[PDB]
Amino acid sequence: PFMWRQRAYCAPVPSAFASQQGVRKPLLRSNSESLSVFSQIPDGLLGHTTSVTMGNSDIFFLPKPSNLLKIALPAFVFMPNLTIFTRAFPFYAHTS
Amino acid sequence: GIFYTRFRADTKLGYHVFINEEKLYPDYSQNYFDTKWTNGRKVYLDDETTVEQLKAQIYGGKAAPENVKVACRGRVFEDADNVAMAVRAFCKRDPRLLLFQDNL
Amino acid sequence: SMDHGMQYSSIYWETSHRTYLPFWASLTQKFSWKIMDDQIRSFLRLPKPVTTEPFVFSSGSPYIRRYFGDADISVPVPLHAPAHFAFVPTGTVSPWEETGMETGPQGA
Amino acid sequence: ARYCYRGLDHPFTLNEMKDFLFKLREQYLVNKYEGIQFPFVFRQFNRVSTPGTLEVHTSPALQQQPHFH
Amino acid sequence: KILRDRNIGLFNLLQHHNFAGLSVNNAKLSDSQRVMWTDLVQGKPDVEDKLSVDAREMKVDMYEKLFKQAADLENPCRMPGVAYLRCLRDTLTETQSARRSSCL
Amino acid sequence: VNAFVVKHNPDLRLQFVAFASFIATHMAITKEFNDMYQRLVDITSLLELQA
Amino acid sequence: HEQPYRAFSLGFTANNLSGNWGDYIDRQDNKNALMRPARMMFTDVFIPTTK
Amino acid sequence: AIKGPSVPHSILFGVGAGCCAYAGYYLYRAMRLTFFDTESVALQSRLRYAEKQKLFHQELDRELAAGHIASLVAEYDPVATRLPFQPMQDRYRV
Amino acid sequence: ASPMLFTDYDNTASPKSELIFMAGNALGYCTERFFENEYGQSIFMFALGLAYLAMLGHE
Amino acid sequence: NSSIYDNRNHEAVRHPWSTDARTFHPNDNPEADRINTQYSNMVSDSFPEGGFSDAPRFSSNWERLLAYHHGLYSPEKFNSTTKTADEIRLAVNDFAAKVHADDPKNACKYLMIEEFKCLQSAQARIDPQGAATKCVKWFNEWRQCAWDQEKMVKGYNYIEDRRARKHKPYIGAPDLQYS
Amino acid sequence: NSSIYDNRNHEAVRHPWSTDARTFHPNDNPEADRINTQYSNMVSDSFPEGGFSDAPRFSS
Amino acid sequence: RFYFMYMARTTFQAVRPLLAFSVFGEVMKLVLATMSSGLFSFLFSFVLAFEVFYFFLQCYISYTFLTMFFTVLF
Amino acid sequence: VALGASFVHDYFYQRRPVAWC
Amino acid sequence: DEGINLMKCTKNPDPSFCAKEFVAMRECNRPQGPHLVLSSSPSSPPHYELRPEVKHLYNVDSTDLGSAVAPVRSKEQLDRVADSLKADLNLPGYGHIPYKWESLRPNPGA
Amino acid sequence: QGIKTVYASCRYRKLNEREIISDRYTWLHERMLEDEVERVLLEQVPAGGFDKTRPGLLLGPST
Ligand SMILES: CCCCCCCCCCCCCCCCCC(=O)OC[C@H](COP(=O)([O-])OCC(O)COP(=O)([O-])OC[C@@H](COC(=O)CCCCCCCCCCCCCCCCC)OC(=O)CCCCCCCCCCCCCCCCC)OC(=O)CCCCCCCCCCCCCCCCC
Ligand SMILES: CCCCCCCCCCCCCCCCCC(=O)OC[C@H](COP(=O)([O-])OCC(O)COP(=O)([O-])OC[C@@H](COC(=O)CCCCCCCCCCCCCCCCC)OC(=O)CCCCCCCCCCCCCCCCC)OC(=O)CCCCCCCCCCCCCCCCC
Ligand SMILES: CCCCCCCCCCCCCCCCCC(=O)OC[C@H](COP(=O)([O-])OCC(O)COP(=O)([O-])OC[C@@H](COC(=O)CCCCCCCCCCCCCCCCC)OC(=O)CCCCCCCCCCCCCCCCC)OC(=O)CCCCCCCCCCCCCCCCC
Ligand SMILES: CCCCCCCCCCCCCCCCCC(=O)OC[C@H](COP(=O)([O-])OCC(O)COP(=O)([O-])OC[C@@H](COC(=O)CCCCCCCCCCCCCCCCC)OC(=O)CCCCCCCCCCCCCCCCC)OC(=O)CCCCCCCCCCCCCCCCC
Ligand SMILES: CCCCCCCCCCCCO[C@@H]1O[C@H](CO)[C@@H](O[C@H]2O[C@H](CO)[C@@H](O)[C@H](O)[C@H]2O)[C@H](O)[C@H]1O
Ligand SMILES: CCCCCCCCCCCCO[C@@H]1O[C@H](CO)[C@@H](O[C@H]2O[C@H](CO)[C@@H](O)[C@H](O)[C@H]2O)[C@H](O)[C@H]1O
Ligand SMILES: CCCCCCCCCCCCO[C@@H]1O[C@H](CO)[C@@H](O[C@H]2O[C@H](CO)[C@@H](O)[C@H](O)[C@H]2O)[C@H](O)[C@H]1O
Ligand SMILES: CCCCCCCCCCCCO[C@@H]1O[C@H](CO)[C@@H](O[C@H]2O[C@H](CO)[C@@H](O)[C@H](O)[C@H]2O)[C@H](O)[C@H]1O
Numbered sequence A: 001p002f003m004w005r006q007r008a009y010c011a012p013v014p015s016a017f018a019s020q021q022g023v024r025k026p027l028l029r030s031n032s033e034s035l036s037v038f039s040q041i042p043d044g045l046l047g048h049t050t051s052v053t054m055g056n057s058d059i060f061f062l063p064k065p066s067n068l069l070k071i072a073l074p075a076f077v078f079m080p081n082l083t084i085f086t087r088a089f090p091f092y093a094h095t096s
Numbered sequence B: 001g002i003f004y005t006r007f008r009a010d011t012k013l014g015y016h017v018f019i020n021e022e023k024l025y026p027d028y029s030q031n032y033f034d035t036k037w038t039n040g041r042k043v044y045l046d047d048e049t050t051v052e053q054l055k056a057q058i059y060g061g062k063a064a065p066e067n068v069k070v071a072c073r074g075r076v077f078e079d080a081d082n083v084a085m086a087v088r089a090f091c092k093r094d095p096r097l098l099l100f101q102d103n104l
Numbered sequence C: 001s002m003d004h005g006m007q008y009s010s011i012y013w014e015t016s017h018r019t020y021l022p023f024w025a026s027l028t029q030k031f032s033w034k035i036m037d038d039q040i041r042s043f044l045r046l047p048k049p050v051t052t053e054p055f056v057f058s059s060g061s062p063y064i065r066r067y068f069g070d071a072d073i074s075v076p077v078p079l080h081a082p083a084h085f086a087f088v089p090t091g092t093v094s095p096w097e098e099t100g101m102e103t104g105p106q107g108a
Numbered sequence D: 001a002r003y004c005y006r007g008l009d010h011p012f013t014l015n016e017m018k019d020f021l022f023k024l025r026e027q028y029l030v031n032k033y034e035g036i037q038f039p040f041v042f043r044q045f046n047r048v049s050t051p052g053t054l055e056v057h058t059s060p061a062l063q064q065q066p067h068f069h
Numbered sequence E: 001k002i003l004r005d006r007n008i009g010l011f012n013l014l015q016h017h018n019f020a021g022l023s024v025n026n027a028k029l030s031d032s033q034r035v036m037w038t039d040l041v042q043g044k045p046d047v048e049d050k051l052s053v054d055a056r057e058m059k060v061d062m063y064e065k066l067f068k069q070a071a072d073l074e075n076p077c078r079m080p081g082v083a084y085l086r087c088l089r090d091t092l093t094e095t096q097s098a099r100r101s102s103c104l
Numbered sequence F: 001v002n003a004f005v006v007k008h009n010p011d012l013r014l015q016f017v018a019f020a021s022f023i024a025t026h027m028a029i030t031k032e033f034n035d036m037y038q039r040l041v042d043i044t045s046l047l048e049l050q051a
Numbered sequence G: 001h002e003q004p005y006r007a008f009s010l011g012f013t014a015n016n017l018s019g020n021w022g023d024y025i026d027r028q029d030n031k032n033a034l035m036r037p038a039r040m041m042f043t044d045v046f047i048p049t050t051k
Numbered sequence H: 001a002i003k004g005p006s007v008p009h010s011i012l013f014g015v016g017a018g019c020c021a022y023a024g025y026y027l028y029r030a031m032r033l034t035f036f037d038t039e040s041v042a043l044q045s046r047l048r049y050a051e052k053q054k055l056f057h058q059e060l061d062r063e064l065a066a067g068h069i070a071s072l073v074a075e076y077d078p079v080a081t082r083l084p085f086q087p088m089q090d091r092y093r094v
Numbered sequence I: 001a002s003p004m005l006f007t008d009y010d011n012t013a014s015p016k017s018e019l020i021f022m023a024g025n026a027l028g029y030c031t032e033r034f035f036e037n038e039y040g041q042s043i044f045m046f047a048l049g050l051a052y053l054a055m056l057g058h059e
Numbered sequence J: 001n002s003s004i005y006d007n008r009n010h011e012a013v014r015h016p017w018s019t020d021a022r023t024f025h026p027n028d029n030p031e032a033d034r035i036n037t038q039y040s041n042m043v044s045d046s047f048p049e050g051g052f053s054d055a056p057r058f059s060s061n062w063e064r065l066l067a068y069h070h071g072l073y074s075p076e077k078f079n080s081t082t083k084t085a086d087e088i089r090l091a092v093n094d095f096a097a098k099v100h101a102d103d104p105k106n107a108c109k110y111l112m113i114e115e116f117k118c119l120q121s122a123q124a125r126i127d128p129q130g131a132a133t134k135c136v137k138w139f140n141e142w143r144q145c146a147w148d149q150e151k152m153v154k155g156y157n158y159i160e161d162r163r164a165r166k167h168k169p170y171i172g173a174p175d176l177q178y179s
Numbered sequence K: 001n002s003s004i005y006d007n008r009n010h011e012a013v014r015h016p017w018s019t020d021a022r023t024f025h026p027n028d029n030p031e032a033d034r035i036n037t038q039y040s041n042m043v044s045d046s047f048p049e050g051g052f053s054d055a056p057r058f059s060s
Numbered sequence L: 001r002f003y004f005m006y007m008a009r010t011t012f013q014a015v016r017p018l019l020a021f022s023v024f025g026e027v028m029k030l031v032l033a034t035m036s037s038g039l040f041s042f043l044f045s046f047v048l049a050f051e052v053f054y055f056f057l058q059c060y061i062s063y064t065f066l067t068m069f070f071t072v073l074f
Numbered sequence M: 001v002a003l004g005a006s007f008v009h010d011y012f013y014q015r016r017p018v019a020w021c
Numbered sequence N: 001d002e003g004i005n006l007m008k009c010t011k012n013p014d015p016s017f018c019a020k021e022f023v024a025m026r027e028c029n030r031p032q033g034p035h036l037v038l039s040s041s042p043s044s045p046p047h048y049e050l051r052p053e054v055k056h057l058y059n060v061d062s063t064d065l066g067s068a069v070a071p072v073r074s075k076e077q078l079d080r081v082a083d084s085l086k087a088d089l090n091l092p093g094y095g096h097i098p099y100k101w102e103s104l105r106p107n108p109g110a
Numbered sequence O: 001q002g003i004k005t006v007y008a009s010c011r012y013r014k015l016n017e018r019e020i021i022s023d024r025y026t027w028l029h030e031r032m033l034e035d036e037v038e039r040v041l042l043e044q045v046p047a048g049g050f051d052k053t054r055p056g057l058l059l060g061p062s063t
């Protein structure tokens, strides 16, 4: 509230300088309202727009013809076997 | 130790404290394991803690400088204010506090 | 010369970029539980939101809600014709005039 | 998502506010001018309406602005 | 011609936005607003002993809001006005006789 | 359920007809609800354009 | 912990790390200068301009 | 179409199945809203908070614009409204 | 001085005892970035495919 | 004009009076070593110290009046030089003293002071639009702080919902508590 | 300005003095029947009879 | 520190083929985008074939190191 | 079994919001 | 009576949460009298009315400030409001679809 | 979790009701304070009301 001619974002809209226009719309409005989203537009369906959900579409099906294969295939190890040597695991886990 | 750390982290709420100037740093020359102040320090507090209690905890219950105040995101706190609620109001989910001198 | 413009940039799909659409996507359609929830609330007499009441208690000055064809779409409108005040004297400033050039206290 | 479910009273910064207003302006222009396309709004479509006798001319050279030296 | 037109337009704009100045020449004012403005311009703002402390606080807040909207930081009288109203806030729980000696 | 279905649609063609009618009715009711919500959304978009 | 993340796509066939498309306002060409004249060659479908 | 096994009967059966599916949806939502919902209350509270915030910001911006306009009362000169060789009117706040 | 002349806000240290959260924070980052989205669905399909291949090889 | 979203960008501003259209060019490719990094030598990269060369000499007083009335002239903007660092500091310190006297127990005080400071530093007297482009951020922060102070004064809170089932992305991740 | 090879085409001509920039628009889509085909009625399609509105009143 | 060393080695051996397939592919694509004539294309076809063979070599190396790193006695 | 599991996983466990205009 | 009714209602509240009682008490406690009242009418929906002697303090054209109850959801009212807004805007370009997903269905997706 | 959720739903309903009524009571308290202030102000109005035709303060000649 100090530099009015230099701070136009805090100034009234040009329709306010015009001296002409149940309940009526306000006569005085500022440009600082542009810094708010729901100043002029309504807040309708504000907290209900993230609730419109749609399901995924992936199908987990792939025929598994094993009659074509006669050899084994390599397989990964995902976790260490804690059912054996459980008490020493923190002590031998760092080795190889 | 793991239990203490996890419980403190998942139960209490912490703040990263900074200080504006070096002349405002506390005197940690006597106490051991911390012989100097470092900005960005994580400090865990209770929900009932006030700005005065925080200031005393920072300055070791000793005479603090004059006109020292706390701010978060540029917004000054009152000394008779709850830190948790003041942060909730001014800097939500950005608890970085700054201690400065308010002469003006 | 802005309406009905030509295609100014090219449209393309980069190799192996995914689409995330199955073959029944066109038959798929959206849905919101909001209409059914409103019906159920009205039938079971569940707590209503305050937006159903036109008067607004969320401020000290009088506000009235204007509804756009539904209670879910409303805007508060102030009723007061606010009186403004200026602790200023009149005729004490001539900004168009350069005052640094005239001799006098106002000039200095 | 930021205001009603995370507790942020000021979800949008200046950049996000500008982005919102940019999209609002684009909506206005799209509904105002029928068929407006990329150069003025971020939008492209192939099936466009042309006059029938489309003239092709070279654009005018860029305006010579006065400069020192 | 230009000055006459500009000043008539300014007058119409001020009348349209319902402004009131040091010369109270506005008929659409409420009696309470007019009393408050005339006290700020011509009389002495003071809280009455008939009021409860809460109503005195409300009256002082109304005075402060009105005067701060009226006078900006560039205005000379803003600091004295705000100081007087702050003295009133400090001396709410007192009588006018005891408040005069302090706020004069 | 299988008994009640076969009791009234014992043949494959009738089962297919019933399944198709079920799909169509589901889609139609969903379309009614969606039309209502779309009218709301259209009002909001028109107010944004007005702003 | 409050700043948002950019989408991630990585595979033997395609990725989204060899380029940057920019923001919604400040956009930029994802392909670099040497291959911009040959953009057609990096597409499964290409719909040219109208001129 | 009412009793006998026919294409109309199958169509009626499908329509009834769809209506029963939507009745089940109604039951699900009714039970959820009647015994398993706090998001509604939380969101209503947050929206009332938002309304208060909106009105506060609105009033603040209005006050700032009003102060901008008040800065013009110093430029305002009621004597310029005077016509040459005529008296000044109190209407223009002497 | 004023609180706005200060800039070094990103030097947010943390107790050295919180290093135990290394893997936790790593998994949380990987979750918020990859696992709980479409790329995470692709990763889940990759795991299912590993199972598929192991079964195929056994048979 | 500066914005790329303006058709007459990099073109001189048009006034009711005749004006030399040769524009001030900011320093876009400055040398690595700028030995003097004081405000004196920095301001010359974005404004001319002696002011712009688009000032009018009105043939009459009513032309001046009409230009002002329509918002096309202000002496504060057209007949003036750049402000020196000392002047800027004096103005900022006076404004800060006045604000502190107005209200010490206010949280947005330093934010208002900072927007004032940034306007003065960006020379809003002679480049108001360009300076507002820089200071609107501190204005917005002040707006936010105003709301925050009001809600702390008048107790305004809301019913928070229960904690979400997946508040933590991973069980081993720490759920840092936030006020 | 008229030429399409001008950047300020269909824009008012700039003068040293202040000028109303609302331009005279030639008749581009005239009606089929132009009952008066005299020069009097034809000249109004390309020029204004009373002249253009860009004349100056020099202060000196 | 051994865990960090092991994870680094594992990730490098796992991404080696991805690198050979992606970054060298980008290089080849640059060359394709820039080249127009026929002699250079005739000579570059062989570079492409060499890249094929190199990819297969990297895949073999990765398979070896991964079966070494994912082999458990018990 | 795969179709049933995919249906459940997609329309009960993997639902995500979508914008509506 | 206003205070008594407010007290009685706030312990056994109405779905409206006693808003009319609150506003009645607020308007009755005014010194010179109420400015805003609830019109007694044989009509089904009641209205909020404004006294004439205070009309100059409010930004209104008439004394009827609208109904005291929100509207009822109606497809017809929604269509009416939408058509009115479209007419007031007068924007050539509304409803235009430059590209539509090719399908036998008229509206793919929605 | 379902038991806790049922209890929480009931508690949240009651709490929403109480919060609404409490905020409206606060509003009413403030408005009643304003009304008291206005009733005290109306005593300072001179007999016969204000002369809304003339300015309260005449601050210059009219020649
Ligand atoms: C070398 C490496 C080796 C090591 C392996 C390492 C890897 C290990 C890990 C595993 C890999 C994981 C990697 C991550 C994956 C993430 C990416 C991803 O998955 O999606 C990407 C990719 C991205 O697509 P998008 O653009 O993003 O769209 C995504 C959508 O969600 C999906 O898009 P969509 O829905 O549009 O596509 C589905 C598609 C296909 O969907 C299906 O068809 C469903 C599947 C059914 C399969 C069973 C039916 C088989 C019928 C065969 C009979 C033919 C006649 C017999 C002839 C014999 C002589 C030849 O639908 C259609 O195109 C139209 C078909 C519609 C009809 C389907 C239903 C009817 C089926 C019955 C036919 C009836 C016809 C009646 C006609 C009407 C008459 C009135 O997704 C797809 O492309 C999906 C389809 C992929 C098919 C690939 C084709 C090759 C399949 C063979 C694979 C290898 C086989 C191995 C041997 C086993 C078979 C013998
Ligand atoms: C070639 C093949 C031919 C195929 C032919 C197909 C045509 C045949 C007709 C059937 C068509 C398939 C229908 C599929 C379902 C509808 C489509 C769909 O999924 O939309 C998504 C949609 C997703 O809901 P949303 O709100 O958008 O978001 C979901 C999120 O999860 C929400 O997120 P949130 O965080 O809020 O989580 C909330 C969640 C929370 O959930 C939980 O926390 C736990 C869930 C319960 C776990 C179990 C705990 C134990 C307590 C329950 C005890 C149940 C067992 C009984 C025990 C008795 C002893 C006490 O609540 C729920 O999701 C409740 C789920 C309700 C499940 C119970 C309904 C009965 C299931 C059995 C139905 C069998 C149908 C077989 C059809 C024939 C297919 C061959 O589904 C729903 O809206 C809810 C479905 C309500 C049931 C509707 C049933 C009528 C429609 C089907 C007509 C036929 C009825 C036959 C009835 C037979 C007697 C049971
Ligand atoms: C801050 C630090 C951050 C650091 C980074 C951190 C990173 C994040 C955290 C990471 C944590 C680690 C997590 C693990 C890593 C994650 C990996 C991951 O998730 O993947 C994501 C990533 C994909 O994610 P995305 O976001 O969706 O990427 C974009 C899409 O991928 C784009 O899709 P697209 O447009 O490029 O289309 C691709 C297309 C590709 O489709 C194809 O390639 C299929 C072409 C088949 C042609 C021939 C088919 C003949 C069959 C005829 C059947 C009878 C006639 C029926 C007629 C209809 C069918 C044709 O579709 C598919 O991919 C289909 C996949 C599903 C089917 C899989 C089939 C597996 C069969 C395996 C057979 C095993 C045989 C063993 C025999 C051993 C020898 C004795 O993975 C990929 O790279 C995708 C490509 C995967 C390669 C699959 C190639 C399979 C080819 C099998 C050929 C078999 C022929 C054998 C011949 C030899 C015997 C003669
Ligand atoms: C040789 C192998 C066999 C070849 C034949 C395979 C194709 C059979 C299908 C034939 C029917 C085509 C329909 C024609 C009528 C016009 C409609 C139309 O075409 O638009 C569809 C589409 C364009 O659609 P649009 O432009 O978007 O407009 C409307 C939409 O399509 C539609 O509107 P919407 O979006 O609203 O509809 C959504 C929804 C509507 O549909 C649905 O919702 C569900 C539909 C799935 C029904 C599932 C069956 C139901 C089963 C019930 C019973 C269950 C129990 C019993 C079964 C148990 C199973 C064990 O999804 C669909 O649209 C599904 C459409 C699937 C298109 C066909 C996909 C196959 C592509 C070609 C594969 C070629 C394979 C390699 C050939 C190798 C030859 C060397 O165009 C095509 O699909 C083209 C088909 C071309 C067939 C070519 C056959 C090979 C000829 C080779 C020629 C040589 C040159 C080829 C170049 C490469 C040379 C090497
Ligand atoms: C054998 C069964 C064991 C099952 C596990 C039972 C839990 C055992 C640990 C309980 C710790 C009790 O000790 C207490 O913990 C809480 C949380 O840190 C602290 O309380 C702290 O958080 C709560 C929540 O705001 C508040 O009290 C306050 O903010 C703060 O003081 C108390 O200051 C401390 O006295
Ligand atoms: C997780 C890592 C292992 C998996 C690797 C995944 C694929 C790697 C991506 C391709 C690497 C080469 O990527 C190539 O260099 C950079 C990538 O930013 C881009 O280059 C572009 O962005 C860089 C920014 O750093 C600019 O400096 C450069 O002027 C511009 O052309 C090229 O457009 C791209 O072709
Ligand atoms: C074959 C598999 C090959 C890939 C294997 C990769 C396994 C290792 C996963 C990555 C571990 C990185 O570790 C993690 O890095 C991110 C930053 O990038 C940090 O995250 C930090 O910066 C990010 C910004 O992106 C913030 O969102 C986050 O709030 C912050 O904590 C995590 O605090 C740290 O725990
Ligand atoms: C002997 C004591 C009981 C021992 C058994 C403890 C089992 C607790 C783990 C169950 C899962 C809890 O997971 C989560 O934590 C607490 C409840 O605990 C709830 O948290 C929420 O409700 C509780 C009420 O109790 C509030 O205090 C809390 O402020 C709120 O965030 C979440 O709604 C729930 O989803």
Ligand SMILES: CCCCCCCCCCCCO[C@@H]1O[C@H](CO)[C@@H](O[C@H]2O[C@H](CO)[C@@H](O)[C@H](O)[C@H]2O)[C@H](O)[C@H]1O
Binding pocket: H024, H025, H027, H028, H031, H032, H036, J162, J163, J164, J165, O001, O002, O005
């Ligand atoms: C035709 C037959 C129809 C059968 C109908 C069956 C109805 C079953 C309805 C169960 C709905 C439960 O819905 C889900 O339950 C859990 C606890 O129970 C709720 O609670 C869960 O999430 C919220 C927060 O996200 C918190 O309460 C808490 O963290 C967690 O416990 C979920 O918010 C709710 O989404």
Ligand SMILES: CCCCCCCCCCCCO[C@@H]1O[C@H](CO)[C@@H](O[C@H]2O[C@H](CO)[C@@H](O)[C@H](O)[C@H]2O)[C@H](O)[C@H]1O
Binding pocket: A051, A053, J165, M008, M011, M012, M013, M014, M015, M016, M017
């Ligand atoms: C044909 C009948 C077959 C019987 C199948 C019965 C299975 C019922 C199990 C349903 C369990 C779903 O569990 C629920 O999944 C949904 C995802 O869709 C999650 O949903 C969550 O994410 C979505 C999307 O962000 C949001 O709406 C919200 O944050 C939350 O609801 C819930 O956090 C989880 O509680």
